[model samples]
Target: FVEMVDNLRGKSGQGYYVEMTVGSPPQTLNILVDTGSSNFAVGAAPHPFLHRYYQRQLSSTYRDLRKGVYVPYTQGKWEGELGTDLVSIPHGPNVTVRANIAAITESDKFFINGSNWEGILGLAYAEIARPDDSLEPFFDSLVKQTHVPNLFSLQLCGAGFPLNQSEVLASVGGSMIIGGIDHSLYTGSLWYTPIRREWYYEVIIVRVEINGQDLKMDCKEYNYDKSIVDSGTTNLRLPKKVFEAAVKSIKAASSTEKFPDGFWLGEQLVCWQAGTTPWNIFPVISLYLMGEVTNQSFRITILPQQYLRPVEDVATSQDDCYKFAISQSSTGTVMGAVIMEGFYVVFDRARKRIGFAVSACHVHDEFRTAAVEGPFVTLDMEDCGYN
Candidate 1:
């Protein structure tokens, strides 16, 4: 709800640590790097599902912290424990915060196929832990305690796979620091954007331009409520009709891949090569907001896959790739990991504007490139609970 500083810094670490206590002596746990949200959670010892080989202990950090616990999600729940302790990221120092530290007792790393995450370091600012417990904001605690106007910036890249199964990491040489911004690394001026009424950040979206002109499609009826900036998602979640109109502005001579979801279900595919064309593909997508700046130029990457309709009454082989049934989300156009790569995207919560510039930055590269070349494939993501 308020603006914060984004401080850049050098990341260093062969490992990180998480602390826990079961009976008498407390123990320390090791965790992975996370940039999307804030808060460090750990799974307690003697967890319900640790015996199934579901959770793997990669470091001596867990051994150091002998006890673990579990807590349930506040709502739409997951079974886990909520606790607080002092710990540190690789390049960052030990800070204390409360978290819903749960262990992967049943499922392998809690839905990630063979994941290294004993628990997640939530990159958002919301209080996702216990309702009564107040955990300090991961970056906020760093800045307030240290008095350094620190920032939490994400240069995320999903594994460039057809399916959403790819390796990902935070920005290169990136770390959650304590003292000050690392001037030796990033080269840019700090800009401020405001966080929206809810947990998401808000930028004034003026217009949606495709290929140089306004999209004449009618999407107003659907109440396209989306958060323009998210480091967590992989692609844009657009309403069926509005998405169609936006794609109309792009023109690709030949596309390498096709799916029944589009052609059969009456949708079209748009493709563009990054370097080999003079198409000037920077379509003008603007965000118009109330009580803020008007007509800001928002850039979007066009991927080459068509949305397929799921087969319901009839069971056909097409069901493999065309699992088109997807539930809607409150966030209007959820800008996923695809649209976030190679640019210095400044989430200046102070000014309420998102500033973007091009660079060689890789997500783990999150831009939605051409469907054929970009990180999209025809496989069904519905099974993963996202479709």
Candidate 2:
């Protein structure tokens, strides 16, 4: 089995990054691992340490397509040229694939001013690729051209609330396992859910509850209740109706006045004050998904500490505030990194499903390769003990 493991790095665990070697002689670059978008691009912004653009001239194997490409995000956009080159993992003797990569010439303020990551390595369907919808994704090329399995698993470790900048260097245990499963990363069995759409890792949310209280949503309504699992996003999102109800419930449990002003600048959550004892004030939120045929439900519980993050505003010189950054959506619910922090997620395109288990963030040096037959396999809840 072809396998590639990379360390995840971030200050607040906002964005998970992976190291990759691209070009002929394999120049090293750190890439933001994103599941929400499908465009593996570099050079949009200057490197943090190097403070220079990605020099395409250094790669002898690079071939320019001369085609203009544009990528749009919630905040900004990127313009670039399509190119192909030999891209591989940073470790020794990894499989090198001639993949379609973008060399961004310019970008909006978001990328130019961002602090983390040199570029993005998209891990979603090619249909979402920028400028062109049919571009071949990086992982797809690796699986088709190499012996790698058509699956990848992510074990994202949590960075405690009121994120410590010093811990950013020490909290690098999370890993992305390509073409295999890391048994040690997750406990018990892996519950698989059918992927409703290929555009993203879409799944059906059978139901939603807060502290055992139902949200009164039509769980079977595929058009409204369908949710996407996106790693690129920082916070959770729900439809306007659900979001309003959730906020009402949360406010009833705790005073919103004491929580500070929760506002959104576009889709980003901005707030102040790192609240204390969130578990006592916040209720446990549970999201349920249905199995393929048996209709068995896989429940994912989101704890209060998991949904909140500590933010320190550098400009205002404010250093306290816990942000419950769940936004309102009109179309579908988006389970961002905040909700995903509680599980070990596996994207299995070959089986047309996604798997999940309680994350083993404290465990180390434990990993194994195994074949996953999904939408049917049952993970023993006792091993994980969180169900």
Candidate 3:
């Protein structure tokens, strides 16, 4: 699991976390909030970005109650107390829920990076939750647990929003509903593949088609460890070989022309493969959600038209040679934000399902928001990534 870096966003400058009371009496521990991840654990040292609230959590008044717990990272490791505690979300009505908090130490991994964050209050409801279970979310653990639909909602603003990709917070307890989608455009009933215990849905891929042409490899045979229906990633990131194969097919039906500043842009059509090459050329990429077939005509234009590199920068190592400027190495293919920009999405964690809603705001809606008066920019400025 990737430990997604957290950005303190929203109307409230303060962030939330999962607090736990360990030892015999159960002390309260406050944690930092994260929605882009699944695992929920904390480090031993105080975060370089520890907010005032975080400092209070580690105060002597709180229990030193370090019990037994372990947190692992791709680059580091950590272990602490695996006990329960009270968690809170500082918001409109402020909520406190019950949760498992790790009294972490150097034995457990900790971040020394100079960020204002303190501890982690994981918001991946689907991963660490049991149905009809209260005090699952760190937010709910701190405040008084209620009976109304214990759900959390986030109205994530796009980069065009006043603050540039801000998250408006709300809660219920089930699936944390974020944005809205138009239901009228799609042709089928909300098709859903059964979700594996790991959180996100696992679909049976029938094929990977670029501009309607199927690639040589069997996508079903590929192994994917983690994937969420996120509207945040900017583009699709298939594994390198998978990306190349798809791009090759996409280029066969399209033309790549050099633009100003040595950037090469590509253009393709769904039917341009009519006179192209072999019969294996253009065929629809299908995703088998259960038994229903959803044709995905994968396109390369999903990358912002501006970021395409015109020429390849050769390297001595073959492994580094094909690494494009915007490559995200995942499965043979990955669907990211560029594609997410055009549609609305909903993640039903309780049902173990994900749904998509097509967006009404096309290109016109995209451009108009950029012109607004705000600090938010279409391009990246902060060294930190939001997703």
Q: Which candidate is the best by lDDT?
A: 2
The estimated TM-scores of all candidates read 0.54, 0.83, 0.50
**Of the pair 2 and 3, which is ahead by lDDT?**
2
Please give, for residues 138-217, the per-residue lDDT of candidate 3 as tens digits: 44343235432333332222221112122233321111222222243222234343333433233333334443345656
What TM-score number comes out for model 2? Answer: 0.83
Highest TM-score scorer: 2
RMSD of 2: 6.7
Model 2, 1-387: lDDT tens digits are 233443667632347777788887777877877888888988734544334456678889998888889887665777888989999876422678999989887777435333346788889998888776678989888888998889887866656544454666456737888877878777767888788678878877766678768877554432254578888777788877778787777667666445434443122344444433335556667776766556356677767666666565555444444567577776568888777677889999899999988776621111311122234233321221111
- Each model's lDDT: 0.35, 0.68, 0.34
True-structure lDDT of candidate 2: 0.68
Error of 3 at 234 (Å): 7.3
Ranking of candidates on TM-score, top first: 2, 1, 3
